[PDB]
């Protein structure tokens, strides 16, 4: 397949089903151009996976992609392949992928049980921007008979926060939304922080959208817990220090208008990942087994 | 200045064993050079990555080295060489290296002999090569050896150099450096 | 000073060879030259000394005969005790040279006992070399490939005292095309930094002088600070020479990150919490300054309350520095243990 009919699968499995993330569909593509290769070599199809990649993360300018291909080339290949005939090693990288795609699925249920334990009763839970994995936490924190109470912000310039309350409403928890400028206001009825991810460096902090690094900031003035959810293919190898040194391709999307920062590990108290809970000095390591 | 492959051949054949020098290390495999059929490029997959044992390595202690690997696939159309070293024995590797060795010696030397004519390009040493050498290992149809064995004999008799298609200009030139470096 | 009096206090004016036979004596030759040289302070250097103990090592490893009956395995480690409780003597030791000791003391008891003595003789001499070769400049030469990608062009970096891991990093990056200038900050008991400015003026870079207690001039302008080290601590802290905590914490406060070099054989298994106790004392007489006609602290000896104090060594917190790069990459300061000795 060439490039066109790759951008046309890319984005027809993107629209296909809203309710799912771009690392899945460039995974999906990925194996989907593994099993239409032709050819007798390794090397060509080495060159031709990683040119694949190349042209998948030149549409869409997202970090979790590129963590994603780079995590799926280093796991299709840990096994012999060293045998005499390509038929068998295609199959065999061919299972391995399957397998992978299989256990990828199964995160957002596991992080759901970890976390959902660490809610009080009668709580007040201040949240920013919209992500599924932190909707499934709430889902699965008052299946279990307990109450809280939620506030939102309204997420310039798109208005995520919205239809993040509009979701919020078919569970019948009671919601407010504030202001962008308001969080230092609001920051002293709240008890604890819970926000999503978009990745996760090597030092223990985190990329997300705009807007992060003033509410964690305000949190820690006030002595309160700040709670990260993030998942395993979201690791990246990258060890930046200020708010500069973010490379510019995820600065600025395809006046000054960022779209996303980056948040520094000695404001943060817990991740919860699929792997486990882990304090921030534990990923500097933890990463570094994973990438084998 | 000068490069041309020491056989005429311009790619191996399967369950061969050639000598390779490590150029760069991937994250699944090993970028290599090949030195028998001229600078070829080649990928040897790491069989379990060594994947324990590569972390608490400098990553760079391997670059540039020397060793015997075996060809198993071969691409003629786009030009890639599977290699393998797991399936190498070391009565095969002391074959390798002779065979590295006597081939060295035989394409310095007919360099240097070349190198008095001063050849402007590799084609005109491309076809001294086939004029003097591979005709030589064709007419005792046996590789490498033939030629090296054919020159440490004509140190005592040069009448065989009068046998083939030699200009007396190269033949001096030649018997000249036979008798300096095999003496 | 009594709070210090723990530590023992040596002169340079001390000559030990003055009793000591001429026509070599049980010292072999070597160790009296090496203890001679660093006495004399001729020889400076974290990385130098190590490279020069290894080299009279070798030289005698070369001369050596086996006793008639005594196996060679137990004889040499019986024979280097006095040799290097003599250059003890001289001088006290580092990280280094400890664990240099160390793995030479493992390899001599690992031989086996059924070769000769020319077999184990070569057998040393290049297990010695291969490790000179791979924990030394290998290592450098990665450390400077990592560090690379943290300069960009119009920075202004910021480095203290001398070392030559620094100095290294500096002029590669320099050559490999990219354009900053650097400011050295000095101390005044040696005056180290002249060095490091000798050499950055001659490779043709622009440069800053200043002294240390100048420090909170200039640092609105700086953007990085970059440290050596001199050995790493099991907690994570961080030994090197005086100030560098100092320029830590002022660093911090005027928010400018800190990293940290250093190379993975000077790791250590002490445990220290504060800059004090375990140090090294230095000659009291060199604070003496020379100002003209005023000339204070001449014969300070005959005032009954005064003391000169003279450390070498300080000890800095993981709170305080944000990056480390060791030839395995670049990783947090806190990590440290997790990493360097889990492989035991």
Redesign the interface.
């Known amino acids: 397949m060439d490039d066109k009919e790759l951008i046309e699968y890319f984005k027809s499995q993107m629209k296909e089903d809203p309710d799912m993330a771009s690392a899945v569909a460039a995974i999906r593509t990925l194996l989907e151009f593994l099993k239409r290769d032709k050819g007798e070599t390794i090397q060509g199809l080495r060159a031709n996976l990683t040119s694949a990649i190349e042209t998948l993360c030149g549409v869409d300018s997202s970090v979790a992609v590129s963590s994603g291909g780079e995590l799926f080339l280093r796991f299709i290949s840990l096994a012999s392949l060293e045998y005499s005939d390509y038929s068998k090693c295609k199959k065999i990288m061919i299972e391995r992928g399957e397998l992978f795609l299989r256990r990828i699925s199964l995160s957002r249920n596991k992080i759901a049980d970890l976390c959902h334990t660490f809610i009080k009763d009668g709580a007040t839970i201040l949240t920013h921007a919209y992500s599924r994995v932190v909707l499934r936490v709430l889902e699965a924190a008052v299946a279990a008979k307990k109450r809280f109470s939620v506030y939102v912000t309204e997420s310039q310039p798109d208005l995520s926060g919205k239809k993040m309350a509009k979701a919020l409403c078919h569970l019948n928890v009671p919601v407010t939304v504030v202001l962008d400028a308001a969080v230092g206001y609001i920051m002293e009825k709240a008890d604890l922080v819970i926000v999503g991810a978009e990745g996760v460096v090597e030092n223990g902090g985190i990329i997300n959208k705009i807007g992060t690094n003033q509410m964690a900031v305000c949190a820690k003035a006030q002595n309160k817990p700040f709670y990260v959810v993030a998942e395993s293919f979201k690791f990246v190898r990258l060890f930046p220090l200020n708010q500069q040194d973010v490379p510019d391709k995820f600065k600025y999307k395809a006046e000054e208008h960022p779209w996303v920062d980056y948040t520094a590990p000695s404001l943060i108290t817990l991740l919860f990942t699929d792997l486990g809970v882990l304090t921030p000095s534990a990923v500097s390591d933890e990463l570094i087994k994973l990438y084998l | 200045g000068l490069s041309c492959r020491f056989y005429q051949h311009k790619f191996p054949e399967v369950e061969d064993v050639v000598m390779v020098n490590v150029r760069s290390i991937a994250?699944?495999?090993a970028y290599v050079s090949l030195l028998e059929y001229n600078n070829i490029?080649g990928?040897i997959?790491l069989?379990e990555?060594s994947?324990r044992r590569i972390?608490?390595i400098?990553?760079?202690?391997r670059i540039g080295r020397n060793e015997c690997v075996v060809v198993?696939?071969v691409?003629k159309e786009?030009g890639?060489i599977?290699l393998?070293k797991?399936r190498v024995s070391p009565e095969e590797a002391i074959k390798c290296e002779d065979k590295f060795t006597k081939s060295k010696t035989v394409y310095s030397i007919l360099r240097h002999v070349a190198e008095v004519l001063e050849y402007t390009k590799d084609e005109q040493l491309e076809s001294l090569f086939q004029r003097t050498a591979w005709v030589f290992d064709d007419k005792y149809k046996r590789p490498g050896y033939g030629a090296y064995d054919a020159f440490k004999h004509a140190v005592s008799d040069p009448s065989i150099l009068d046998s083939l298609d030699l200009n007396e200009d190269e033949r001096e030139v030649l018997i000249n450096n036979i008798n300096r470096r095999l003496t | 000073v009594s709070l210090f009096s723990h530590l023992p206090q040596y002169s340079r004016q001390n000559s030990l060879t003055q009793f000591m036979s001429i026509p070599s004596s049980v010292i072999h030759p070597a160790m009296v030259r090496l203890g001679l040289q660093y006495s004399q302070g001729l020889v400076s250097g974290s990385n130098a000394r190590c490279i020069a103990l290894l080299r009279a090592l070798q030289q005698v490893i070369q001369d050596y005969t086996t006793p008639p009956n005594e196996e060679l395995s137990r004889d040499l480690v019986n024979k280097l005790k006095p040799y290097m409780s003599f250059l003890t003597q001289c001088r006290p030791l580092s990280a280094s040279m400890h664990n240099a000791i160390k793995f030479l003391n493992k390899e001599i008891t690992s031989v086996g006992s059924s070769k000769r003595e020319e077999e184990a003789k070569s057998e040393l001499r290049a297990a010695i070399d291969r490790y000179v070769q791979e924990k030394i400049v290998l290592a450098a030469q990665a450390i400077s490939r990592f560090a690379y990608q943290k300069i960009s062009n119009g920075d202004v970096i910021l480095v203290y005292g001398c070392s030559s891991l620094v100095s290294r990093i500096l002029q590669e990056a320099w050559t490999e095309g990219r354009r900053f200038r650097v400011v050295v900050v000095d101390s005044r008991p040696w005056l180290e930094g002249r060095h490091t400015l000798r050499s950055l003026v001659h490779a043709g870079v622009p440069a800053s002088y200043l002294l240390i207690p100048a420090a909170s001039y200039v640092l609105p302008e700086v953007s990085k600070v970059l440290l050596g080290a001199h050995a790493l601590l099991a907690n994570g802290s961080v030994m090197s020479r005086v100030g560098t905590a100092q320029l830590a914490l002022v660093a911090r406060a005027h928010n400018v990150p800190v990293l940290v070099c250093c190379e993975t054989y000077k790791f250590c298994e002490r445990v220290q919490t504060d800059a004090f106790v375990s140090n090294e004392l230095d000659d009291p007489d060199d604070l003496q300054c020379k100002r003209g006609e005023h000339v204070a602290l001449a014969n300070w000896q005959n005032h009954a309350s005064l003391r000169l104090l003279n450390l070498v060594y300080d000890v800095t917190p993981p709170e305080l520095v944000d990056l480390v790069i060791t030839e395995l990459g670049m990783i947090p300061c806190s990590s440290v243990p997790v990493v360097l000795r889990v492989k035991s």
């Open positions: 994250e699944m495999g490029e990928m997959l069989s990555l994947r972390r608490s400098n990553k760079l202690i198993i696939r691409d786009k890639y599977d393998s797991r």
